[PDB]
Amino acid sequence: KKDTTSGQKLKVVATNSIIADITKNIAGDKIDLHSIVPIGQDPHEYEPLPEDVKKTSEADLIFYNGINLETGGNAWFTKLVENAKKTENKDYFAVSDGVDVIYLEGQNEKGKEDPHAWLNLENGIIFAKNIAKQLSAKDPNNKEFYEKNLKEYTDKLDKLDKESKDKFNKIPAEKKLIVTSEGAFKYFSKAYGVPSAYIWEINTEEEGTPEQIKTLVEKLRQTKVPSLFVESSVDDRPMKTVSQDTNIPIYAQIFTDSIAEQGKEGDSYYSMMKYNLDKIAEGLAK
Ligand SMILES: [Zn+2]
């Protein structure tokens, strides 16, 4: 589509820092990249700022999660691309295309998917493949470079994934449960064999009401779970109350919907996943 050598770098927009980071690993300095949702902020419901609107409108390529991630705020991503006059599978692409979808509990229809596919490293590899292919389709002069970066990156994710299938077999069955504010661990639970439980299933619902806290506390009181976890991108008040009512300490802050701030541990898709795996493993062995 574009002969970037005879003009500007490809202009790329990613909806959140996880997709942006994977993108940076594939494209390097070949592109101009803008990420919309700030590090540490919820990507489910976001209100685009003037710079997001400008960059999205000037973009050659737009990557979003798809599978019911950016749909809060009465479909914020949908309104953004409508306003920027961009077309699906021409200008903007879901990087989850090709993952095996898991839906919200008791649901199975389109638009009711659980969006947290990247917490399974096999799906992070699928995100990178979609990104590299769409980068190469739009900027064919840099295809060998994107492909070389893709192979090195998926090899690195693949080694971490294989090695991480050994992580939780030592945890006693009564300790074996990941607890987070949002129910964002469905793909991770399936991939790494560790059940998960939450305060609220997906960020677009209610914010950690007293009923939701009480429901998790009562479930937790029937277990031997030694640690709780709190995500970097949600209010930690709900989990602190759960922690206080159950007497179970919050072992660590983890990463779900955002990478960590630049320079801190977890500041990339790879390192947030590596971090998550180790801290959950330590936390559940307490
Ligand atoms: Zn989420």
Q: What is the DSSP string of the chain?
A: ---GGGSPPEEEEEEEHHHHHHHHHHHGGGEEEEEEEPTTS-SSS----HHHHHHHHH-SEEEE--TTSTTHHHHHHHHHHHHTT--BTTTEEETTTTS---BSTT--STT-B---GGGSHHHHHHHHHHHHHHHHHH-GGGHHHHHHHHHHHHHHHHHHHHHHTTTTTTS-TTT--EEEEE---HHHHHHHT--EEEEESSTTS-SS-HHHHHHHHHHHHTS----EEEETTS-SHHHHHHHHHHT--EEEEE-SSSPPPTTSTT-SHHHHHHHHHHHHHHHHT-
Cβ(285)–Cβ(171) below 8 Å: yes
Output the CA 167–ligand 1 centroid distance in Å: 24
257 is in an annotated binding site: yes
Distance CA 52, CA 15 (A): 9
Whose CA is closest to 269, among 138, 104, 113, 156?
Answer: 156
Contacts of 164 (CB under 8 A, 6+ apart): 121, 192, 277
Read off the tokens for 176: 């074996």
Angle at 20 between CA 17 and CA 22, to 5 degrees: 110
**Strand 92-94's sheet: what is its strand order?**
31-37, 10-16, 61-64, 92-94
Q: State which approach was used to obtain the coordinates.
A: X-ray
Whose CA is closest to 186, among 123, 268, 95?
Answer: 123
Structural domains in the chain, sorted by start: 1-155 (3.40.50.1980), 156-286 (3.40.50.1980)
Output the CA 114–ligand 1 centroid distance in Å: 9
Output the CA 43–ligand 1 centroid distance in Å: 7
Output the CA 6–ligand 1 centroid distance in Å: 40
Output the CA 158–ligand 1 centroid distance in Å: 24
Cβ(31)–Cβ(86) below 8 Å: no
182 is in an annotated binding site: yes
Output the CA 225–ligand 1 centroid distance in Å: 23
* Residues of the chain with a following break (C to N over 2.5 Å): none
Whose CA is closest to 259, among 274, 269, 244, 248?
Answer: 269
